[PDB]
Design a protein around this ligand. Structure first.
Ligand SMILES: Nc1nc(O)c2c(n1)[nH]c[n+]2Cc1ccc(F)c(F)c1
Ligand SMILES: [Mg+2]
Length: 274
């Protein structure tokens, strides 16, 4: 019944039925959720307007100068055509993506950004999560299901969004780029491994996976999780739907077309965990 919502597309509904059945048989003990952030857990559009990405939330804020905003936009102008070019292989795109993210991160480090300002920028932003986010985050937490959120954005921004929406629970594990601040609270670098849009993947018995994404690249987020026995991939198809629908349906198990809610995922979780 969950899958009878009007936004639901399935190329092989019988296969979806078998995967959901295996997930239910395995129970929450075997389940983990692997999800993209922007335009998957965050809402795509509201009240006739696009909702901001994590990148937009910081870049359009009061703590980024207009000159820095122009330089970030110039980097985007150069690298976006490379990023989306289907005739460049993922391997050929990698060094360009590393360059772009390294350059953007360094520009942010050359501003005067203070830790306390991150909460402020998010609070003043138009950040929005999909409808049903409380049920989604609470169901996972109450059922002890780890949620891995991958984002090539800024971890601090993601965390403040989820915290300010009152759903940042200890079962959430964000894999993203976290800021490093000096003793005076000023941004000085980024922590750990660089995550760009083409290395959002894993690079305990939780062998069943629900993957949530909104781009064709998100299909790989669970690659490299060892010993996965069952995976159900759910893809939000937010825009350019006539152009994208076939490729989405042919790779994602379930596609949700212009669905600004987590209702289908929530219903699947309730079915699997009850
Ligand atoms: N705040 C911020 N601003 C940027 O421009 C950043 C960033 N963080 N990290 C990496 N880039 C470059 C980039 C990569 C993908 C995008 F979709 C995009 F809009 C911008
Ligand atoms: Mg996304």
């Amino acid at each position: 019944s969950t899958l009878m919502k009007a936004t639901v597309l399935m190329r092989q509904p019988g296969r979806v039925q078998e995967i959901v059945g295996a997930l239910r048989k395995g129970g929450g003990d075997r389940l983990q959720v692997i999800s993209d952030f922007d335009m998957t857990l965050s809402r795509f559009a509201y009240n006739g307007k696009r909702c901001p990405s994590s990148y937009n939330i910081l870049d359009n804020s009061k703590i980024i100068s207009e000159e820095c905003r122009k330089e970030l936009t110039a980097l985007l102008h150069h690298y976006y055509p490379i990023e989306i070019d289907p005739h460049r292989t993922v391997k050929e795109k990698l060094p360009h993506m590393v360059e772009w993210w390294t350059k953007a991160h360094n520009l942010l480090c050359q501003q005067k950004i203070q830790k306390f300002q991150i909460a402020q920028v998010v609070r003043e932003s138009n950040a929005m999560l999909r409808e049903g986010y409380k049920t989604f985050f609470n169901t996972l937490y109450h059922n002890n299901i780890p949620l891995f959120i991958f984002s090539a954005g800024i971890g601090d921004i993601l965390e403040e969004i989820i915290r300010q929406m009152k759903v940042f629970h200890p079962n959430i594990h964000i894999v993203s780029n976290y800021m490093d601040f000096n003793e005076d609270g000023f941004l000085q670098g980024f922590k750990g491994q660089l995550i760009h849009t083409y290395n959002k993947n894993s690079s305990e018995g939780k062998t069943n996976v629900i993957l949530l994404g909104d781009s064709i690249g998100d299909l790989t987020m669970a690659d490299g999780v060892p010993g996965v026995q069952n995976i159900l991939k759910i893809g939000f198809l937010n825009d350019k739907v006539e152009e994208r629908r076939e490729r989405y349906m042919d790779s994602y198990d379930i596609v949700l077309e212009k669905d600004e809610t987590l209702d289908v995922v929530n219903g699947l979780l309730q079915h699997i965990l009850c």
